[PDB]
């Protein structure tokens, strides 16, 4: 029993982190096979970041200008290319600790673990969600760029995120491992405002199911609702519309608890309309939306 | 910027987890040097757990009755002893992945990372605090016993916790790595009620400092207080008494933010008396007490 904001074990990703230095800029790289992936803004002076022309900046860089250190051993850079907003540094040594891996582009509402790194060294691991506005709410200081987000499926690391930017509002923007930003963000120090940070309704419902499974039941009510009725209330509270796809995804939690998804929707409707009245659910005074239905099943069943 | 409930990177501890089986009971062990540490209740049938005589139960066990598997390779058990509530299984092979390590007994209010494991396989990592009543609020299913709690200081793992028990209230009890329970708990399936789960005041204050550092300032007020005045309010709200030792420990956060500890105490006093009025602090609607002053400094400075 008990339900915790749980990250994937980070060892497999720890073995992939390196330091990348170009001129005076140091950040993190991801070493898989004989390629090191890092944010292309490694080539920028903070001055460059105001209006960088990356293709022009990159012309002035050679293989020997990219200093790649794995622990306290230097890797030899034999090639470099830009793919979207990431640099791929070809090295002469395959990472001997390369796990089975994939690159995946996640959807908003999907959760992942971040291994926060500085100078290629892991400092910590925490669980995130891709927000509906394609930001994440991370913990990233200067030097943390190139820190990665991931999921693990048994022995296969799916990399979904590389850290690039903090917006002036202190929220975070990055890319997939093909270097494509999540959302409309660019690797330039300019005005970039995030859109509405809506609540991930399907994740809230998953977490309410987690609460019931774990003995927190005070919020279960005598009501039901419809998708359309619930959605009128979701809209008012800046919750994402709930779709039949979401209801289908919650089916196994519905089944396990014997609470129909639309009944749990009606419980969530009353919580939105009435608030918590100073009560808590799984040690939270707000409705948690950074657990997916898959997360709740995994944690409640003990998948390794 | 941003402040997250962050666990230590778990790789060093992942390399230490093994499976221990005795008869039909399987749980986790910690492999350091040529010793595997596991809960002594590995020798119990669920029947035994009602009133176990561990010395008597252990007489019927030989080295070959303890099956220890590290990945899918069996370790040869050449000795076994009971120390308090843990078994030490001597194996013929030193763990080649043994990190630098210490065994530490933590105080209530101290935080640590848990690597939740099943069948010697890591499922997840999360951050805990030793509660003032010497419980932890974990996420542990059947098979999770022998999962460990730890802190990392650069390259040295300090092991502070081994998981043993869930109380009927769904909170968790375990030992240090010398096998001494935290608090008054015993490895017996009997009535064991936890005492008052008080709030770790010094950790709340640390987290309020983290909030200010991260731009969340709405709760800073025009007031100050005294330790004695604050403590009258702490008592009423089941907060731990604040001591001059706590004020001294908060000194670096006081210094960095320029907010006197007793001024932050007066902000916390108003939050207790007035509540949050539907506002949040670092994405929480309650006062977070599972960050130590050391945690806040580490995260806010980016220690690896």
UniProtKB/Swiss-Prot annotation, chains A, B:
Activity regulation description: Inhibited by pyridone-containing alpha-ketoamides compounds 13a and 13b. In turn, alpha-ketoamide 13b (tert-butyl (1-((S)-1-(((S)-4-(benzylamino)-3,4-dioxo-1-((S)-2-oxopyrrolidin-3-yl)butan-2-yl)amino)-3-cyclopropyl-1-oxopropan-2-yl)-2-oxo-1,2-dihydropyridin-3-yl)carbamate) inhibits SARS-CoV-2 replication in human lung cells. Inhibited ex vivo by michael acceptor inhibitor N3. Inhibited ex vivo by compound 11a and 11b.
Domain of life according to the entry: Viruses
Positions in the Cytoplasmic compartment: 1-304
Localization (cell): Host cytoplasm; Host Golgi apparatus; Host nucleus
Listed result of changing residue 189 to A: Does not affect ability to cleave and inactivate human TRMT1
Active site: 41 (for 3cl-pro activity), 145 (nucleophile)
Cross-link (Glycyl lysine isopeptide (Lys-Gly) (interchain with G-Cter in ubiquitin)), chain numbering: 5, 90
Mutagenesis / variant outcome for changing residue 205 to V: In strain: Zeta/P.2
Coiled-coil region(s): none
Subunit description: 3CL-PRO exists as monomer and homodimer. Only the homodimer shows catalytic activity. Interacts with host FBXO22; this interaction promotes the proteasomal degradation of nsp5.
Protein name: 3C-like proteinase nsp5
Organism annotation: Severe acute respiratory syndrome coronavirus 2
Residues of the full protein shown: 3264 to 3567 of 7096
